[PDB]
Amino acid sequence: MIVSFMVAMDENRVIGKDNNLPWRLPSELQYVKKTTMGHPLIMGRKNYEAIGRPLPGRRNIIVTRNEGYHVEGCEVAHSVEEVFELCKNEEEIFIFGGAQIYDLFLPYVDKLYITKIHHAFEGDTFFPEMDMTNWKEVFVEKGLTDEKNPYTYYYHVYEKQQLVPR
Ligand SMILES: COc1cc(Cc2cnc(N)nc2N)cc(/C=C/C(=O)N2N=Cc3ccccc3[C@H]2C=C(C)C)c1OC
Ligand SMILES: [Ca+2]
Numbered sequence: 001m002i003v004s005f006m007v008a009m010d011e012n013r014v015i016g017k018d019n020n021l022p023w024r025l026p027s028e029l030q031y032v033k034k035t036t037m038g039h040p041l042i043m044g045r046k047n048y049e050a051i052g053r054p055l056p057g058r059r060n061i062i063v064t065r066n067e068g069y070h071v072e073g074c075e076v077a078h079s080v081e082e083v084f085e086l087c088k089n090e091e092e093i094f095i096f097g098g099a100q101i102y103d104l105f106l107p108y109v110d111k112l113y114i115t116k117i118h119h120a121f122e123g124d125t126f127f128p129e130m131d132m133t134n135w136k137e138v139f140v141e142k143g144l145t146d147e148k149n150p151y152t153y154y155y156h157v158y159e160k161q162q163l164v165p166r
């Protein structure tokens, strides 16, 4: 099972402001949709509630400690172990954020899909620092910048850097 982080952040790792995206880049979300089609999206409650609804064509799994939390059209999981159990047969899952949710899955992550937005926004929550020497870029592509997508941004995808034995 490939555990993948899916993330959009600015030049200071900002991923949110008052629980929302400080930017509006529909093309970026179109990339998320394409990349995650037919795979579970794993996200924290705050993240889910900020989006407002289930994202169709996807197994939406909301992670909260709250045992009574249910929402129609979504699965709820209360721990990492419960997510791995729910996704036991899945080829790849996408950790969709909440800083705390990324942290929960850090010890297991195999692949990073990172959109880097070339701008500094006002933010209050951040993608945790990561030692990228353990990672190797395998794909990059400049995002579509235009009237609807004002900022300049780049899709990056990273896999584990293999070590050469001494
Ligand atoms: C902090 O707030 C957010 C954070 C993220 C996380 C995210 C974004 N981009 C990338 N590459 N990685 C992420 N983890 C999404 C979102 C996205 C929310 C949001 O409005 N949507 N997210 C998915 C989507 C895909 C295609 C077309 C339109 C959408 C759109 C529509 C919904 C299903 C209602 C977000 O909004 C509140
Ligand atoms: Ca792993």
Ligand SMILES: [Cl-]
Residues within 6 Å of the ligand: 043, 044, 045, 046, 047, 048, 097, 098, 099, 101
């Ligand atoms: Cl969250």
